[PDB]
Every structure is written in structure tokens, then in C-alpha cells.
Amino acid sequence: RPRFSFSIAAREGKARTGTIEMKRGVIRTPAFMPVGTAATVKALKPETVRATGADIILGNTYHLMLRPGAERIAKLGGLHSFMGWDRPILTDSGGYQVMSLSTKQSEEGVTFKSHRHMLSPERSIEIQHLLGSDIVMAFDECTPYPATPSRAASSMERSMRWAKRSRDAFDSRKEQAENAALFGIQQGSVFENLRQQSADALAEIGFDGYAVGGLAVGEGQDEMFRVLDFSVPMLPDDKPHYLMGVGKPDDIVGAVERGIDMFDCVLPTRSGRNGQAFTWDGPINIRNARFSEDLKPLDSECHCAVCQKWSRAYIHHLIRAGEILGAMLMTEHNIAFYQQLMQKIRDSISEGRFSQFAQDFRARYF
Amino acid sequence: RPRFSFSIAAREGKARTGTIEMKRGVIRTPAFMPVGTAATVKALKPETVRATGADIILGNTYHLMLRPGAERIAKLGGLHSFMGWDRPILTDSGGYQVMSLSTKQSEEGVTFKSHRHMLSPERSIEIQHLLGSDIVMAFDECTPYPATPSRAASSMERSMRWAKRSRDAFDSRKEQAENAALFGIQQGSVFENLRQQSADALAEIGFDGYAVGGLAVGEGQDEMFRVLDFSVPMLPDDKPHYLMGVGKPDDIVGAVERGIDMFDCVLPTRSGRNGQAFTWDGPINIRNARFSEDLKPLDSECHCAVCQKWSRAYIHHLIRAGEILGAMLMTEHNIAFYQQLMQKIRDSISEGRFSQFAQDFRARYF
Numbered sequence: 001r002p003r004f005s006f007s008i009a010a011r012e013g014k015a016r017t018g019t020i021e022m023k024r025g026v027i028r029t030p031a032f033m034p035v036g037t038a039a040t041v042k043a044l045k046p047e048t049v050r051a052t053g054a055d056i057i058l059g060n061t062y063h064l065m066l067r068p069g070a071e072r073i074a075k076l077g078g079l080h081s082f083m084g085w086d087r088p089i090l091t092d093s094g095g096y097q098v099m100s101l102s103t104k105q106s107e108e109g110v111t112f113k114s115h116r117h118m119l120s121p122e123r124s125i126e127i128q129h130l131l132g133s134d135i136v137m138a139f140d141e142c143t144p145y146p147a148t149p150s151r152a153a154s155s156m157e158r159s160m161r162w163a164k165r166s167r168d169a170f171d172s173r174k175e176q177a178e179n180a181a182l183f184g185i186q187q188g189s190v191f192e193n194l195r196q197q198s199a200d201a202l203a204e205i206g207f208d209g210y211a212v213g214g215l216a217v218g219e220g221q222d223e224m225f226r227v228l229d230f231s232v233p234m235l236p237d238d239k240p241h242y243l244m245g246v247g248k249p250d251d252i253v254g255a256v257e258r259g260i261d262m263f264d265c266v267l268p269t270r271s272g273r274n275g276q277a278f279t280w281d282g283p284i285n286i287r288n289a290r291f292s293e294d295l296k297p298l299d300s301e302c303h304c305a306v307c308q309k310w311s312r313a314y315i316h317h318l319i320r321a322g323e324i325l326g327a328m329l330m331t332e333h334n335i336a337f338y339q340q341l342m343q344k345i346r347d348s349i350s351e352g353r354f355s356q357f358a359q360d361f362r363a364r365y366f
Numbered sequence: 367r368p369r370f371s372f373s374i375a376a377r378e379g380k381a382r383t384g385t386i387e388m389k390r391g392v393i394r395t396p397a398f399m400p401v402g403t404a405a406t407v408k409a410l411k412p413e414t415v416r417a418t419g420a421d422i423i424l425g426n427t428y429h430l431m432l433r434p435g436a437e438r439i440a441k442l443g444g445l446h447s448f449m450g451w452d453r454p455i456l457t458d459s460g461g462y463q464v465m466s467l468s469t470k471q472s473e474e475g476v477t478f479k480s481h482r483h484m485l486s487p488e489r490s491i492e493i494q495h496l497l498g499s500d501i502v503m504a505f506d507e508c509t510p511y512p513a514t515p516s517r518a519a520s521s522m523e524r525s526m527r528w529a530k531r532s533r534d535a536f537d538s539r540k541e542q543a544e545n546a547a548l549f550g551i552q553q554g555s556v557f558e559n560l561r562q563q564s565a566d567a568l569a570e571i572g573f574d575g576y577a578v579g580g581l582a583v584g585e586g587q588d589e590m591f592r593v594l595d596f597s598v599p600m601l602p603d604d605k606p607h608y609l610m611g612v613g614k615p616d617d618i619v620g621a622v623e624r625g626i627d628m629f630d631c632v633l634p635t636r637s638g639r640n641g642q643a644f645t646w647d648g649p650i651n652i653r654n655a656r657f658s659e660d661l662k663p664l665d666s667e668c669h670c671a672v673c674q675k676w677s678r679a680y681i682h683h684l685i686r687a688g689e690i691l692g693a694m695l696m697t698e699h700n701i702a703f704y705q706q707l708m709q710k711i712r713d714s715i716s717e718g719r720f721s722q723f724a725q726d727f728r729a730r731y732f
């Protein structure tokens with residue numbers, strides 16, 4: 001396989017389905033990336049993550065640079081070897097979680113104290129190299145919401161200068177430039193002119209893929225969709241479109257309808273350890289007393305191993321008892337459900353019936 | 367298969383190897399039973415428990431009678447169905463954990479408040495029936511250590527009266543008497559005459575197997591072995607001998623040398639979530655800094671899936687980070703190590719070289 005090749009096999013409106021080919025594997029799009037925090041997809045062996053259908057996972061840089069450390073992971077053979085996942089890994093660039101979980105900002109980057117460290121475009125790209133990332137994200141600033149037009153502009157402009165620094169850092173590292181891909185991140189808050197300026201700046205630098213940054217930061221679904229409506233068409237059509245940090249099943253469906261190809265979210269893993277299970281009839285909270293004697297599986301149609309073997313009653317008991325096996329089973333089912341959703345999306349676009357699928361999905365889920 | 371058949375295939379000194387055949391499966395002896403607390407072997411799917419080599423697991427009655435409740439588990443189809451383990455389950459009778467984890471004692475049984483309930487020989491045997499246990503333990507009193515000869519005698523006498531009540535309760539329940547086995551429990555503290563009286567009482571009532579109760583209660587290995595030396599030969603030779611709550615690998619080896627056939631302990635699961643890993647060169651604590659860059663597996667010879675795939679360095683990181691996957695991997699390795707120990711014990715007895723194995727095992731483990 002090539003370092004990076006994105007092919008679009010079918011389209012419906014703004015929605016696309018196709019493949020990203022990389023050295024470590026093929027990614028079917030639209031894609032959902034389970035999140036590995038601290039070098040593990042919580043409560044799952046990598047083989048289980050792959051059995052759910054995942055083609056790629058996301059690695060969080062902030063946690064890994066703190067523990068176990070990026071240089072240590074490189075000394076040990078890289079993140080793939082370390083955690084036992086041999087397919088593609090997308091790594092975030094670290095600043096979103098620095099600003100949410102740990103700080104002093106400047107044009108150079110951000111200094112912060114672990115919940116002292118520094119993060120600059122150059123150091124972010126180097127950490128992602130030391131981890132052995134397949135898809136490297138540019139170092140950006142996720143503008144807070146709401147933002148004034150002046151502050152959104154100033155923030156977006158900084159991120160575009162950092163995008164250029166990220167590009168040059170990545171390109172200066174032969175092994176990284178030859179084997180990995182680099183994605184740029186559009187900013188601009190909710191403002192169409194700033195989103196356009198950001199798209200133009202990123203296309204002029206040139207990236208393998210383009211993320212829509214700065215969303216899912218409290219603006220709500222209607223506003224996120226309004227911004228996606230004008231923002232995604234600004235990005236190069238022939239490269240993947242990644243919506244960072246999204247999201248709930250209905251957010252994914254509407255984002256695909258607006259041209260997004262890639263997603264990640266801690267919702268299925270996080271909320272699964274919490275007791276929320278996704279089903280085609282909407283989410284349920286398995287801790288509710290109504291499930292204490294329910295012998296049905298979490299979802300009536302789900303093909304995952306959890307729904308083949310255990311009841312709602314048993315998983316209700318495990319989560320109420322705080323048992324590790326409850327987090328394992330809930331997480332496997334929820335990531336399998338997300339992957340089945342992505343498969344249904346890909347098949348319906350391929351068959352020119354995605355509009356119908358989206359409508360049917362929502363009528364039943366809600 | 368029969369309800370219960372114990373066959374001895376080979377002997378060496380007091381050590382025996384053979385099989386227990388039951389309706390739900392064959393148990394190879396000497397056997398180690400992983401412990402299921404609250405209807406789960408912590409951090410393992412049942413398929414993983416079976417992949418380590420386990421033929422039978424232990425179900426704790428005290429926890430299950432409190433949550434989810436024994437009548438609820440019966441309504442749901444029994445413990446096997448509920449947790450997804452279709453092979454034999456041995457259930458404890460509940461009083462050991464009542465006295466350690468929750469009480470008013472009388473000749474009728476014990477009343478206690480959940481960390482209000484009652485437990486009598488008749489109710490214990492009924493709870494084990496409602497769970498669908500394959501091997502039912504008699505309801506006993508684990509005498510505290512140290513005990514005076516008067517108190518040990520009074521306690522042992524009560525337990526033998528409860529043993530008779532347990533036998534009659536079990537026999538009065540046709541479905542239970544036809545499909546399950548019943549084990550009696552010898553008491554008597556460290557006193558040879560009381561151990562003999564207890565063995566005589568239990569053999570006169572008649573059981574499918576005999577446990578050595580009242581040990582591993584703080585007397586220490588030398589004293590436990592001294593009591594096993596005279597106590598195990600008192601029990602019927604042609605039935606299984608079960609040493610409750612034991613134990614560390616060296617305790618198991620010496621107990622087999624003294625005629626024990628069955629074991630259970632939370633050590634491998636419990637201590638695995640804590641960071642202790644068993645190895646043929648003795649235990650290690652994977653949280654120690656020395657393992658942070660160690661690429662070797664937990665044990666150099668272990669055949670388990672964890673040692674095939676992940677390093678000490680990765681498991682060190684997971685346990686230090688409090689990640690669920692660290693408890694999963696440590697638990698699978700430690701239960702696999704215990705099962706490999708039991709396999710080595712069974713093969714060495716079968717080959718008339720267990721004495722040599724015990725000596726070699728200790729020289730290297732210590």
C-alpha cells in the first residue's frame with residue numbers, strides 16, 4: 001500500500017463513501033475511530049476493538065506525553081507495538097486536552113503543568129513521530145465558544161501560522177514524511193468568512209486531509225450543522241474531512257449528510273462505562289431498575305458478541321455492582337454499535353439510499 | 367455423564383491425580399477454581415476463564431444472595447445462564463463471608479445485616495439450589511484462630527450438627543439431589559482429636575467430597591501443613607479433598623503433597639488487579655519502576671495470551687495508570703499461571719515425578 005491514498009467510491013448529495021489506503025491498513029469511510037487514552041481503548045483488548053469493525057483508532061498525545069512519555073514509547077518500539085494495535089493510528093496534537101485538562105499561551109505554543117511541560121507545533125509533530133502515528137494532526141487552537149469575531153479571527157490566524165509550522169516540521173522529518181499523513185485543522189468559530197479564510201490558508205499549505213475544528217464545544221447540534229453546511233464545501237473535495245470530537249449517533253448521521261468522512265468520540269467508551277447503551281430505538285441506561293429482570297440483549301438486532309451472549313439483566317447487575325466486566329461488555333457493545341452504524345451509512349451511500357436511511361434511522365431512534 | 371464420579375488415575379505418596387465427572391463437565395484434579403464474586407470472575411469473560419484451563423469456578427453465595435438475589439437469579443434461569451459459564455460451579459455456603467464481611471449466631475444459623483438477612487443450613491442449601499450450583503457446600507462455622515480446645519470443640523460440634531441438617535436439606539430436594547453433589551467440611555481448628563471426631567461425623571453422614579475447613583485463617587504455612595499432615599488421612603480416601611481458601615503457589619504444592627485435590631483463592635485475581643504477577647521465579651510487582659522499560663513478558667515460559675502479546679513495560683504502564691485493561695491482563699495471566707501449575711502437578715503425579723517437581727519448583731520460585 002501507499003503512504004496515503006483517499007478514493008471516493010460513491011456519493012449521494014454531499015455524502016461520500018470510499019477508502020483511505022495507508023501502509024498499515026485500509027480505512028473504510030465514513031469511519032468511526034474508537035479513542036485510545038493512555039495507550040488503551042478503555043476496557044478492550046486491541047483484538048476486541050478490531051472485532052467490532054474498527055479500522056483505525058485515535059491516540060491522545062496529551063496523556064501519552066505525560067505517562068508513559070513519548071521518548072519512552074519510542075524507545076520501546078512505538079505505540080503500535082506497545083499497545084498491540086498494528087493498524088493505523090491517528091494522533092491528536094495535544095493542545096485541546098492541554099487547554100481542557102491541565103497553562104500559558106504564546107505564539108510559540110503552550111506551557112502547562114501536568115494535572116511543567118511545553119507544547120509547540122514542532123514539539124507536537126515530534127511527539128506524534130515518536131509515538132509512530134500514521135495520521136498526524138497539525139497543532140492548533142480550539143477557539144472557545146462563544147467567541148467574538150475579533151477573538152475568533154485572532155485565534156484562527158494563529159492556528160494557520162501553526163499549521164504552516166506543523167507542515168514544515170512534518171516535512172523536515174524524512175521518515176515521518178514518507179510513512180505518515182498530515183491533516184490540517186480549519187478554525188473560525190461559527191463565522192463563515194473566517195472559516196473561508198482558514199480553508200484557503202490550509203489548502204495553500206496543502207494537507208493529506210482536513211479537519212473541521214472548533215465545533216462540539218457547546219454550540220449545540222443546530223448550530224454545529226449550520227456551520228458544517230457552509231464550512232465543509234470550503235475544504236478540498238478530494239481529501240478526507242474529519243469532524244473532531246463528534247459524537248452521538250444522530251450527530252454522525254447529519255455530519256455525513258454534510259460531507260464528513262471521519263469521526264472520533266469518547267461517548268461510546270465513556271458513556272458505556274457509565275451505564276448508557278446505544279440501541280436502534282435510542283439510548284438506554286442499563287442501571288435503571290426496569291432492566292433488572294430483562295432477558296433481552298442490549299439491542300435486538302446488534303450483531304456484537306455481547307448481544308449474542310448476555311442479557312440486559314446481567315449487564316445491569318454488573319454495572320450496579322461496579323464490576324470490571326460490566327465496563328468491558330458495555331464498551332464492546334457500544335463500539336460495535338457505532339461500527340454497525342458506520343457500516344449502514346457506507347452501504348446506504350453506496351446504494352444511493354442514504355437519504356432514506358437517515359430518515360428511517362431518526363424516526364426509530366427518536 | 368453421571369451426577370458425580372471421582373476417579374483416581376495415579377498416585378504418588380499422598381498425592382493423587384484424576385477426574386471428577388459431573389453432568390456439566392469433567393474436572394481434572396488436582397484442580398484450581400477461579401473465584402466468581404458477584405457472578406463474575408473479576409475482569410474476565412467466561413470464555414477467557416475457560417481458555418486459561420479452568421474446568422470449574424467457585425461462586426460466592428454471600429454476595430449473590432444480597433445482589434442480585436438468589437430468587438432473582440433462579441427466575442432468570444440460574445447462575446450458569448446468567449453469567450455465561452456452562453461448566454461446573456462450586457458454591458460456598460455463605461457463612462465464612464457473613465462472618466468476615468457483614469451478625470447474631472445461634473444453633474439455628476446466623477442473622478446479619480448486609481454491608482437484614484438470615485442464613486441457616488436449610489436456607490444456605492436452598493440458595494445454592496436457586497443458583498443452580500453443581501457442587502454444594504455444607505453450611506459450617508469457620509472457627510476463628512487461635513481457638514481454645516473448648517471453643518474449637520463446641521464450634522466443631524455445631525458444624526457437624528449443621529452438616530447433618532445440610533445433608534437432609536439437600537436430599538429432600540429431588541432435583542438438587544439428582545443433579546448436584548454435596549461436600550461436607552471438617553472443622554476442629556489445629557487439634558488432632560477434634561479433627562478426627564469431625565472426620566468421623568462427616569463420614570457417618572456421608573458426602574460426595576470433603577473439605578478441610580478452618581485453615582488459612584492466620585496460623586501460617588508451617589502450622590497449616592502440620593494440621594494437613596494428620597487431617598487429610600482422616601477423610602475418606604476415595605472422595606475428593608478440598609482445601610478452602612488456599613492459596614499461594616507453594617501452599618498448593620505442599621497441600622497436594624498432603625493429599626488435597628481442589629483449591630480456590632482470590633489471590634491470583636485480587637492480587638493481579640493490585641499489580642502482583644506470578645512467575646516461575648516467584649512473584650513480581652509490576653508497578654515497580656524497574657519494569658517501566660522491560661520488554662519481556664510477565665513470565666518467560668508462560669503460554670498465556672498475555673505473555674504472547676504484551677510486555678511488562680506496557681502492563682506496568684496500565685496498572686500505574688489505573689486502566690481496566692491492566693486488571694484484565696494481569697488477571698488472565700495469573701489465572702493462566704495457576705492453571706499451568708495445576709497441569710504440571712497433574713502431569714508430574716501421573717509420571718511418578720511429583721516429588722522431584724515440588725523440589726525443583728521451590729528451588730526456582732524461591
Ligand SMILES: CCNc1nc2cc3[nH]c(NC)nc3cc2c(=O)[nH]1
Nearest residue numbers: 092093094096142213214215216245
Ligand atoms: C487536539 C487536536 N485539535 C483539536 N481537537 C479538538 C477536539 C474536540 N473535541 C470536541 N468536542 C468533544 N471538539 C473539538 C474541537 C477540536 C479542535 O478544534 N482541535
Ligand SMILES: CCNc1nc2cc3[nH]c(NC)nc3cc2c(=O)[nH]1
Nearest residue numbers: 458459460462508579580581582611
Ligand atoms: C463458606 C464455606 N465454608 C468455609 N469457607 C472457608 C473459606 C476460607 N478461606 C480461608 N482462607 C482464605 N480459610 C477458610 C476456611 C473456610 C471454612 O472453614 N469454611
Ligand SMILES: [Zn+2]
Nearest residue numbers: 302304307333
Ligand atoms: Zn451489541
Ligand SMILES: [Zn+2]
Nearest residue numbers: 668670673699
Ligand atoms: Zn502469562
